[PDB]
Symmetry: C5
Subunit: 211 residues, 5 copies
């Protein structure tokens, strides 16, 4: 703050974050799962198949977590900096019903806050297999997207689904063939017969309609 | 906590040889492959081609990666570039395997390594009778590309209802796997591969 | 100017001072980043889906005057791979494809410390196409800003078809680039963005 | 087998192996053998004269500086091809990048032979006329080095096809009739020297 | 006949990487670097009559010299293959390309012992150009601008030069190909940038 556009300060913070960050290791502070907070803000619904139950969409994946080893006294340093994600540890998030690669359309940077929180918001385009039934009714279709960690169980990573549907058309495209009805993010946990340990995910329920 | 996990990752990088196969004694390295399908995206009966998504459940061990986890974590997530991985290939594939998931493996304390990419990939196989109640049966041949049977053995394993999409255009009747071997006129040595047979039909 | 030795040394100097991940802010002032798009063709237009497939030259310029040298007996500009430089993390907010880059990824660094960067980009967008079969034409807006830097770190300044292709199915009516400000009911600080207005139509 | 034997052989290869320099022993060209074994014909366009196919590029050449005594050690190993010199093979009538569908590894034999066989999907312009008849279409593919003279790289075409059935998809909408490979040396106004290739001729038709 | 001393080739390659400067224009004598560019078309695949776009495959014959790479070819090879990773290469771009160039060949060059570098990627790119009368006897006449992307004329000068490499199975034939020197000057920047106009005149067959 104040002296925020201090280039030397910024260089040093980044040097520090690199001396300290370990990108392949989960920043479990203590014992608790890393609380990974995830929220999708959709931008567009591009392609929709009534027949094959497949949607093409574009969403901003608002993602956050803390690694307080990264932290620093921002008394006379800047409050945040931007850091290429290849430098930081990043939750290994994935969509379990994804049917195409997550396509990132944005620079792969993240903000680190002086308190050790990281804000990561990539713009993603991706296809899913989900219920497209009734997309032309006016109760609308409801497409459910499941996202959590691919390899870290619940005692290692937990998903917080805190989200608001009020600001939703601050994000969505005025020019879509579709319109958003509601977005519902519910936290739940999934186990698997083969395997111990429950994996936290957020279930993002996308309610939408052809205009 | 994470200084343990950090140090376990250091040990893995010390010992691991991502390019050399971890042969115990003079035994083959035993690889378990088990496909659990999630989607069947496209199917052509005129060309005999299929576009599927599946979780490739894979396990083997390297005991040199093992550690005493009395008072340290039991497993850790590790980037597969740091480990040896079986060089597996679907012999009858017709697209590159597109991996949909972070390329991370789980390394267990005993030296077991758990790796399971979600894969999207296209195959040429028998689609005759997809529109029929008895369904088409498509076999996918997965084995090692460079290691013959004395270096790598591929052992199948395993139920399917817990993975496959309800919203699919198709349903799964049955998925069965069997160990198979591959030889060639030109080439001495046999190659193990698992034959996954996907029996399926339109809803 | 072309004395090769001067050039290898200027590039060595730049790689010593260049901090490719750190913003070149000076005097606790933002980095000023002029952006201007020069459209080069409009390849595919879809009026049912409101998507446009365009190819454009993105004139980008800003300065880091630590990179400066005394060119009194030295070349005034050099070409420098952008791997070696900080670059504004520009993104198009209503893009729907990743920016496919058709050109060598070099920049020109000028002895005064100004950096001239201009990639040819083909990218699909979600914009307004209604009226493209009308003489007043479609108007399609593209919003470009920094992805992670708010206004106090990065500013984006605003500024015919000397560039546009004469073999496109479409003709350009006008282009206007106004500097608008973005905030969200979410995050405190404003983001500086240049809204580019492309008014164009089909020929007939 | 024996892991540290295998590790050590890898170390040895990475000491001696020069991935960017041709392995010319006793000053004559590197012989490269090339055998294509088609796995499927996925798409043919009869009017645009283009075929899309899948094949196994059986490639072998020798690099004797790579050799070791295999009395009490493995006979071959697997090696990532980026640790090795590979021939710079190209298909002159290819109209798409080669899409390698398999692990990019090779087998180094203890006599210094390299064994490399990528599975490849590529599109070619060739003759697809008569694909619906039964003398068939014959699609000629031309492969050779992109930058090396016959004096630097030589191309062995030796090739059987009695075993075509072992490779080709039974479920293809086409059937192979024959595949013959002929060496062929080409000169260029550009350059003094001639560059060898191999014509592969894919005589095929629908079923 | 000493083209094959493998150790000799190792050392030349060693010498090249020591002297080479992959990100520095190799300007001799305060000359601009002279780059010859020459296209030998191979195919024309997807001509679209309405969008006015064509899809071509062509071998970009490209050459220039860097005398600092030169060695005595007296008792050593005349040329060597070298990865372009290790050499400077002109930042050439097709100004009216609407797709990225897709290089279909190993990205190597030949360095001759005089410092001449021969570089020829086979390329497959999509262009926005005049495709009027493709199925007439006059043909379509599609022109392609290829120049340095960041170097002006005092830095790089681009110089020009049948149908001997064009595919007979193409649905098109080549009438003529002409290549002209050219400049350019934008109401934006002072200097002029040299380019090459390549004029491909062609038509459907029959
Ligand atoms: C509360 O919502 C969030 C939760 C977690 C992480 C990020 C956000 C977030 C950040 C955010 N910006 C900062 C930011 C941080 C980091 C990366 C990119 N951006 C602002 C902004 C402005 C213009 C383009 C893009 N992003 N904007 C929105 N809508 N949400
Ligand atoms: C027999 O089962 C296996 C055999 C070998 C390897 C993996 C498995 C396995 C692991 C597994 N998970 C852990 C894991 C290990 C490693 C990588 C990713 N995941 C659970 C889980 C849950 C939610 C998303 C993802 N993975 N889940 C399933 N179904 N199978
Ligand atoms: C206002 O003009 C600009 C502002 C900022 C950055 C670049 C430009 C600019 C540069 C420019 N050239 C130099 C250049 C600099 C750097 C990179 C590429 N090119 C000339 C030229 C000519 C033929 C192809 C390409 N570029 N041309 C145009 N029209 N604009
Ligand atoms: C005459 O045979 C060849 C000549 C030259 C190069 C390779 C071969 C070759 C090798 C070969 N295998 C070894 C190998 C070496 C290297 C890479 C992959 N494989 C076995 C095998 C069998 C099933 C799938 C994969 N590979 N199989 C066949 N059919 N041909
Ligand atoms: C006037 O001719 C040229 C001018 C400038 C640059 C290249 C050439 C050139 C070189 C050339 N060959 C050498 C070479 C050098 C380097 C890379 C690839 N090849 C021969 C050859 C052989 C087989 C495939 C391809 N090219 N062939 C043709 N047609 N043109
Ligand atoms: C941060 O630094 C300031 C220096 O003025 C100091 O007063 C303050 O106590 C420090 N805070 C912490 C938590 O160390
Ligand atoms: C592992 O280490 C613990 C102490 O850390 C020791 O008591 C034990 O004997 C060791 N071995 C096994 C198999 O637990
Ligand atoms: C640059 O150098 C020249 C001579 O080397 C000198 O005359 C001049 O004062 C220096 N500084 C500037 C800003 O030109
Ligand atoms: C191989 O090794 C053995 C023992 O090291 C040695 O006696 C022999 O001469 C070597 N060469 C051959 C061809 O056996
Ligand atoms: C090397 O070059 C020099 C001068 O360019 C010449 O005198 C000599 O004949 C050449 N060959 C050898 C072997 O020195």
């Amino acid at each position: 703050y104040k002296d925020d556009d201090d280039k030397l300060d910024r260089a040093d913070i980044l040097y520090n974050i690199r001396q300290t960050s370990r990108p392949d290791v989960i920043p479990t502070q203590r014992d608790r799962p890393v609380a990974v907070s995830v929220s999708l803000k959709f931008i567009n619904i591009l392609e929709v198949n009534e027949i094959t139950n497949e949607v093409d969409v574009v969403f901003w994946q608002q993602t956050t977590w803390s690694d307080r080893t990264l932290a620093w006294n921002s008394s006379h340093s800047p409050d945040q900096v931007s850091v290429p994600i290849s430098s930081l540890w990043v939750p290994d998030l994935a969509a379990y019903n994804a049917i195409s690669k997550p396509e990132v359309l944005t620079p792969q940077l993240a903000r680190v806050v002086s308190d050790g929180e990281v804000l990561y918001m990539p713009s993603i385009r991706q296809r899913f297999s989900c219920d497209v039934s009734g997309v032309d009714t006016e109760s609308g279709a409801t497409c459910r997207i499941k996202i959590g960690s691919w390899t870290h169980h619940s005692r290692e990573i937990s998903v917080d689904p805190t989200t608001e549907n009020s600001d939703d058309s601050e994000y969505f495209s005025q020019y879509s063939r579709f319109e958003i009805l509601d977005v519902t993010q519910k936290k739940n946990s999934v186990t698997y017969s083969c395997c111990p340990e429950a994996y936290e995910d957020v279930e993002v329920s996308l309610n939408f309609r052809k205009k």
